[PDB]
Amino acid sequence: FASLIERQRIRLLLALLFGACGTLAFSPYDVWPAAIISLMGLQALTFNRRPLQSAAIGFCWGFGLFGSGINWVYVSIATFGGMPGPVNIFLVVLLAAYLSLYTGLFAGVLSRLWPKTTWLRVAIAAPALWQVTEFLRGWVLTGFPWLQFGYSQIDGPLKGLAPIMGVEAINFLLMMVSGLLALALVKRNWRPLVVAVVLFALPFPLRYIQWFTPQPEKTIQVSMVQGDIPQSLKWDEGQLLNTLKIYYNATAPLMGKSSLIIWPESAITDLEINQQPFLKALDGELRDKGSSLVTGIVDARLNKQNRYDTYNTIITLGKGAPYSYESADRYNKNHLVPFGEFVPLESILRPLAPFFDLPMSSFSRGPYIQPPLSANGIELTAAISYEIILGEQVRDNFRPDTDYLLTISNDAWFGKSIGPWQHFQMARMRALELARPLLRSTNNGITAVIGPQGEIQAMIPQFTREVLTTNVTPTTGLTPYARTGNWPLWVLTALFGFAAVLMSLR
């Protein structure tokens, strides 16, 4: 049994098993210790492997993590994309394989510069190189920072580290802690595990410090509405009036009683200019009662060059924010979803390979930093769906005078899969590091109110048409992550990178 692990093909098979165990740590399978096992399974099979041989181990580990965690993408591709089954499976495998290069790149470089299995490789070299490769996965071709082992600790021992340096600190720390556990197992030494136990127990008290301050006499009654609208590519024509009637009939009783009313992404499945009387009259009704509505709409502004820019807008109506087509209380989606809203790199792919379905018209991008939306005297930092998994853009748009965090989204393409849950967990992450309540409204998704510590305050069942009426108290105060950002971690990464690379160049 000891003579079988040294085989290369045995290492690859175990990489799939240990890689797949990582997906059992996210929201649908709330098992946080399944991330340490996956990480310690990564930097324990790569031990005593020459370069270009441990990269295959890392690639297979990544293929087992992104091939079993990111597989809900098949639901959206098969159901809506007009492509045959073999092509649909091919794209999911290709996406898993592509995301596995960064894991493969991490292993091929870790075992090249640091071949010997020592504490320098696992405690120092691995977390610094892991953070760099994770950044590259989240930066190349607009990135895809999905399935990061820092969101699994939203309710865990390491949740206190999120307000200090962000989610990436948990990813950095878990790789360091998991590596020492792997070093202890392989080398049969109690020192690596003793250090790992102490290192893992240090951030536990950090979850009992409240950087925020709840404000009792400023609370409102949010009334986020879950449409349960069936999905379509063209959004249909007759169904345009039905969805407007569904939201309006489910909102009119909520007016007056509720201060803020929130609708999901693309709640109005039409261009903003096309429905002016509906919005102007609705704003008048809300203003006369004392409620403000925040809804996601698609607007095609006319640029100074006489070319339309189809933004993904979040308009605000009602009391405290009168609606006007020239108003500044709008949010335009900056980071578009690859292959869903825009082609990451066209003119080399669209004419070359028209067999794969691509969107004929692509959305435009808004400013990177935008002021918080004003709604009935409340400042909200919007983040449309995919933008909530980006911990940097949300922090940059965040301001001290921000009351709530908005996560207008529509994860109805993926059906009953685990994608909506994993997205919900990442959205839940951007409420503990910023210490602001998060108001997430979705269509056929997890419509919930997240507290200032990544805690689910109120929630409604998925795939049903319901309104989530609850009281939310705004919080004040700045976390160390909000005040500084992600640069304190990159200083630590640079210092560890400088220290580790110098040791590899004796």
From Swiss-Prot:
Gene3D superfamilies: Carbon-nitrogen hydrolase
Compartment(s) where it occurs, according to its Swiss-Prot or TrEMBL record: Cell inner membrane
Membrane topology designation: Multi-pass membrane protein
One example of a Gene Ontology biological process annotation: lipoprotein biosynthetic process
Any one GO CC term of the record: outer membrane-bounded periplasmic space
GO molecular function terms noted in the UniProt entry: N-acyltransferase activity
Reported impact of residue 146 to A: Loss of activity
Transmembrane regions: 8-25, 32-46, 51-66, 85-114, 119-139, 167-187, 190-208, 486-506
Effect of gene knockout: Essential. Depletion induces juxtapositioning of inner and outer membranes and alters the architecture of the cell envelope. It causes mislocalization of outer membrane lipoproteins. The mutant has a copper-sensitive, temperature sensitive phenotype.
Domain CN hydrolase: 225-474
InterPro entries, per the entry: Apolipo_AcylTrfase, C-N_Hydrolase, C-N_Hydrolase_sf, LNT_N
Membrane topology, Periplasmic segments: 26-31, 67-84, 140-166, 209-485
A Pfam family this chain is assigned to: LNT_N
Topological domain ranges for the Cytoplasmic compartment: 1-7, 47-50, 115-118, 188-189
Domain of life of the native organism: Bacteria
Stated consequence of mutating residue 414 to A: Loss of activity
Active site per UniProt: 265 (proton acceptor), 333, 385 (nucleophile)
Known EC number: 2.3.1.269
Pathway: Protein modification; lipoprotein biosynthesis (N-acyl transfer)
Alphabetical keyword list: Acyltransferase, Cell inner membrane, Cell membrane, Membrane, Transferase, Transmembrane, Transmembrane helix
PANTHER family: APOLIPOPROTEIN N-ACYLTRANSFERASE (PTHR38686:SF1)
Family assignment from sequence similarity: Belongs to the CN hydrolase family. Apolipoprotein N-acyltransferase subfamily.
Record note on quaternary structure: Monomer.
Purpose: Catalyzes the phospholipid dependent N-acylation of the N-terminal cysteine of apolipoprotein, the last step in lipoprotein maturation. Utilizes a two-step reaction via a ping-pong mechanism. Lnt undergoes covalent modification in the presence of phospholipids, resulting in a thioester acyl-enzyme intermediate. It then transfers the acyl chain to the amine group of the N-terminal diacylglyceryl-modified cysteine of apolipoprotein, leading to the formation of mature triacylated lipoprotein.
Name the UniProt record assigns to this protein: Apolipoprotein N-acyltransferase
Organism for this UniProt entry: Escherichia coli (strain K12)
